[PDB]
């Protein structure tokens, strides 16, 4: 059973990560992420949404999933990995 690794770009353009789905989830639920935050799922395994290794806003990740439970990261791994 696979857990994803994620990166994100801050407002100074620095790349942080890779951080696990669980970590990303916690920060999401913590309210730390803006919907404008550019994030990326690392292409460590195949996945059915089609977001491996691309940078998209958190808001766009959610438009693609069309439904989330507690957070888009956990949802992604559950539904697409």
């Amino acid at each position: 059973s696979v857990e994803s690794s994620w990166r994100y770009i801050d407002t100074q353009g620095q790349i942080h990560g890779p951080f696990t789905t669980q970590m990303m989830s916690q920060w999401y639920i913590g309210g730390y992420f803006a919907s404008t935050l550019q994030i990326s799922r690392l292409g460590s395994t195949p996945e059915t949404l089609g977001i491996n290794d691309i940078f998209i806003t958190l808001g766009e990740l959610m438009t693609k999933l069309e439904k989330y439970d507690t957070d888009p990261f956990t949802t992604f791994d559950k539904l697409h990995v």
Binding site: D10, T11, Q12, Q14, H16, W27, Y32, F33, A34, L37
Partner: peptide
Amino acid sequence: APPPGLS
């Protein structure tokens, strides 16, 4: 506790 680079 906050993610690095975001505040």
